[PDB]
Amino acid sequence: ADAKALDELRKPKFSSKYLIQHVSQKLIPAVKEWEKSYQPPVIHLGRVLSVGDGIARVYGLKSVQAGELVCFDSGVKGMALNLQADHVGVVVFGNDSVIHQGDLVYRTGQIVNVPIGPGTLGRVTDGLGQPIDGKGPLTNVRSSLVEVKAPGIIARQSVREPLFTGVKAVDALVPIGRGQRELIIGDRQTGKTAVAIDAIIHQKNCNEQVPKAQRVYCVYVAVGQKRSTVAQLVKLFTQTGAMRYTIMVSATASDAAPLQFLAPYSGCAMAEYFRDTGKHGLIIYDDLSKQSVAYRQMSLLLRRPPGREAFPGDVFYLHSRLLERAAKLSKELGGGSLTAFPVIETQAGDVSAYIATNVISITDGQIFLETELFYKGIRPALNVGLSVSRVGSAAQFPGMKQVAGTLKLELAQYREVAAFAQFGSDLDAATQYVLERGARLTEMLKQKQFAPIPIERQTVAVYAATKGFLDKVRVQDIVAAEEAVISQVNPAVFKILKANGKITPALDAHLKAELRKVKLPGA
């Protein structure tokens, strides 16, 4: 049955037509009496052969592009993943219980896209761009693809601009450049979103003070999160005023796994509107470890082979092609930026997991959130020894760079001499200076939630702590002394530090002087 033997059946070899002409006068009368039992034939439309596990196998669709939005007659969208010779397998962006075998599949003619623009600012959308906030459709908007390739080497520049988080431990010790990716990695319940929420609230305070080109438009993507937490977050952004600059992409835990897999690409495409028009974006992928679990579900249901942790093997490319789109563009492309904050949930502090080590080898730094520093009340529980930001360093606030070089230094010795004194029986009194300055600086760096601090009021509080001016206070009233420093010091010294950028020696003298007339609560 070789192929040379079957193409001989192309040319006719009967020389006898006594039932070629017999059924040709009886076929059309036979077909005509079974017409209400024929579904109409399908060539450029599609018909569902088989649906189940959130994957539909579609007969027909002769001209679908690979990776194209297809629309079922139930109104549900899909994406043509694999075009095969006999069918096209689509993945259903929604609930597969409303798709039946025999349903018509329509072609939209466009590769999978979301509405991007200025009119998507302020809105709560799903993983496909359809708004779920109930306040209408998206107007003043246009469609852009969710799988855009990242800009190349020549379309980029180095990060220069300092993108203040408003978190004291972050902007002092691991500062964030404006086109940078920074992993927020930690255990469950360690203030992962707290660091990313305080970054978003802080841009609302800064956007109303910068001249329209240094404004940061945030995007928050929730993958696998409960709807109530997402709804409690849109209420917090609406009441802080941060919703004016924020897009909220939401694919909750009840949503389909292709809607949670696609939601960071949908949100990255909306944040790429500001990168590609010279503005500045900030995107948070909250639980990118939940987006890999949703993609692991689609790969196992597509019967792709398991991997190291049963992940598809292309789960690195899932996150690498996502986070490479967070870039600082060059001057001929507008100079826009996109800053990513992926969030990875860690099980029992184990950072040697598969998805954790993947995103570490993609992103530019990490913000490690220790679950033992979080239980002791040190919040944000920044693991200072492990948290890295080298791309954002030498791009930070110049005045903070003077006062935090000794802050990282006096914390580097503090971890050395707390490792040497695991118990109190030996007292050197030259390391007790480090135990009294290290416990001073730890209390300075911890701050409470949903109140981000400007960078000029954050430089002075570390100026008042790495130097003297707080050795009077024992360890307890330092949080009260910091608000005693910030309120009692003349607010005209915060304008000089902000406008000059750094601590001039004219201001170094004045701020040593104003820090001596502060009524410290520890007396």
Binding site: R156, K279, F316, E324
Partner: protein
């Protein structure tokens, strides 16, 4: 025009099947796709059996239809090679991605060839001085060797491979090729801009005086492009070795990415998965690539390859296969990095073929074996030092722990590429100063100094320079009370006077979002295409 022009049969991610009605292309031949938005070439991987070839796309397949015309080029992927490719950045298929014009090609070489034969091999071992203490002592590199840096996501393989570009690749008088296989794009641009400011890459009419050519297949590329861009980097390095006949420095960042990209593809080629979900052909795919990166009798390639280990697991199928392919393996550890020791080289897991008494001399060899004997016997003690503490040790064993903590800190050093984020300037340490320095700590000449005098210093002259600074500051901690530059009149204007010198910034209040934006009309209904390809709203049934 019809035959030798096939059509796209089926698309499964990066894998495209093309059916040719006659004259199938050979395996490894490249196939252009007509009518794609970008240039999509496909490398033929398999003959499927029914006039169908199975191909690997070197770009994205989003936009492929199952009738698309596919033209065979009759040859593999052929990239520009020669002295005109220097100072340029290429992708997997040889296109310039640096916007500097077309590449002045001396020749057009296909990226697929066999290894040099057994008669072509060169057996010569001379040392490569890197200026790194732990490298030049314990696992010294070979000047025509294969060098592997083994790392676990953040332990410092890229900083180490960037320091070897700083130390070795300037004193080395040949050409360099940097193959970036599946790494960060920012690093590529950072390395591209730090070579232009160093004069390693010269732009404009001075392009011929460049010493490095870059081939970049970074981690935004599809898995077909990252599985073949290492072969594009060898082909540029093999032209300088075979035809030009000179010594090449080949730096491959994340060599494991080539193995990982073939593992993303092997699932879709219909292959039963191997151990850990890897492709069954893991040892021969990596083998057929690594056996090309050698020194022949006509030229030399000194290859440094960063190898990423997946879950800090050195027994994983892709790090474990690479170990047999290297003359020197520098294993970087995570626990060494958490003690603050940089470069985070495991001294008892790093190994060099170069560390032989005949090859490096008996004085160098006995210091390295004595350093490893102290660090191993200290590792045998750490189970008791954790539980019982150092109080229960014999004082013969306390001298072991005291010397091993000293040589552990002394193996670390500051890098000239790491001073941009550490602040400490970098120290190139000559080979004679590492052998002299570590021999003194082994015999006992420096038991006087503390542990932290050895931390982040160049040579043993600087341990004594730092033991004084540490000693000197145990006296001086104060006396900054009065007689300042910070009093009232001397250099200081009024504070309200400084507020008037602030230039006021006009905030434009309107956010500038609708400047040039065109807004397409989103319909109230889902717009779809009917059987005739016409834009029709979605019909009303379900």
């Amino acid at each position: 025009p019809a035959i030798d022009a096939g059509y796209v049969s089926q698309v499964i991610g990066p894998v495209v099947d093309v059916r040719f009605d006659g004259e199938l292309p050979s395996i490894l031949s490249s196939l252009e796709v007509e009518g794609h938005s970008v240039r999509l070439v496909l490398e033929v991987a398999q003959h499927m059996g029914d006039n169908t070839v199975r191909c690997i796309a070197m770009d994205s397949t989003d936009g492929l239809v199952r009738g698309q015309k596919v033209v065979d080029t009759g040859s593999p992927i052929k990239v520009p090679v020669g002295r005109g490719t220097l100072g340029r950045i290429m992708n997997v298929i040889g296109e310039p991605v640096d916007e500097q014009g077309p590449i002045d090609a001396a020749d057009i070489w296909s990226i697929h060839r066999e290894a040099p034969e057994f008669t072509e091999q060169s057996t010569e071992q001379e040392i490569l001085v890197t200026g790194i203490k732990v490298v030049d002592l314990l696992a010294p590199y070979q000047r025509g060797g294969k060098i592997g840096l083994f790392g676990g996501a953040g332990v410092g393989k890229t900083v180490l491979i960037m320091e070897l570009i700083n130390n070795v690749a300037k004193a080395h008088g040949g050409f360099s090729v940097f193959a970036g296989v599946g790494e960060r794009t920012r690093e590529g641009n950072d390395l591209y801009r730090e070579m232009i400011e160093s004069g390693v890459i010269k732009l404009g009419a001075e392009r011929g005086n460049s010493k490095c050519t870059l081939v970049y297949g970074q981690m935004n590329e599809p898995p077909g492009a990252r599985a073949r861009v290492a072969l594009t980097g060898l082909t540029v390095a093999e032209y300088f070795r075979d035809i030009e006949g000179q010594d090449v420095l080949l730096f491959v960042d994340n060599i494991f990415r080539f193995t990982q990209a073939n593992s993303e593809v092997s699932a879709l080629l219909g292959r039963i998965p191997s151990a850990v979900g890897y492709q069954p052909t893991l040892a021969t795919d990596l083998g057929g690539l690594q056996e090309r990166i050698t020194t022949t009798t006509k030229g030399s390639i000194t290859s440094v390859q960063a190898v990423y280990v997946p879950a800090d697991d050195l027994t994983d199928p892709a790090p474990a296969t690479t170990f047999a392919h290297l003359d020197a393996t520098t294993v970087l550890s995570r626990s060494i990095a958490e003690l603050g020791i940089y470069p985070a080289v495991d001294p008892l897991d790093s190994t060099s073929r170069m560390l032989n008494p005949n090859v490096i001399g008996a004085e160098h060899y006995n210091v390295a074996r004595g350093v490893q004997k102290v660090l191993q016997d200290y590792k045998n003690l750490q189970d008791i030092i954790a539980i019982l503490g150092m109080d229960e040790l014999s004082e013969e064993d306390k001298l072991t722990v005291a010397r091993a903590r000293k040589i552990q800190r002394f193996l670390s050093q500051p890098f000239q590429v790491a001073e941009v984020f550490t602040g400490t300037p970098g120290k190139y340490v000559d080979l004679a100063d590492t052998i002299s320095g570590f021999q003194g700590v082994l015999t006992g000449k420096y038991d006087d100094l503390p542990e932290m005098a050895f931390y982040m210093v160049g040579d043993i002259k600087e341990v004594k320079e730092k033991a004084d600074k540490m000693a000197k500051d145990i006296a001086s901690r104060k006396e900054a009370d009065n007689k300042k530059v910070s009093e009232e009149l001397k250099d200081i204007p009024s504070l309200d006077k400084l507020v008037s010198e602030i230039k006021e910034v006009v905030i434009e209040e309107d956010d500038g979002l609708e400047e040039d934006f065109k807004a397409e009309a989103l319909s109230s209904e889902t717009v779809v295409l009917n059987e005739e390809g016409k834009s029709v709203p979605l019909p009303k049934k379900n």
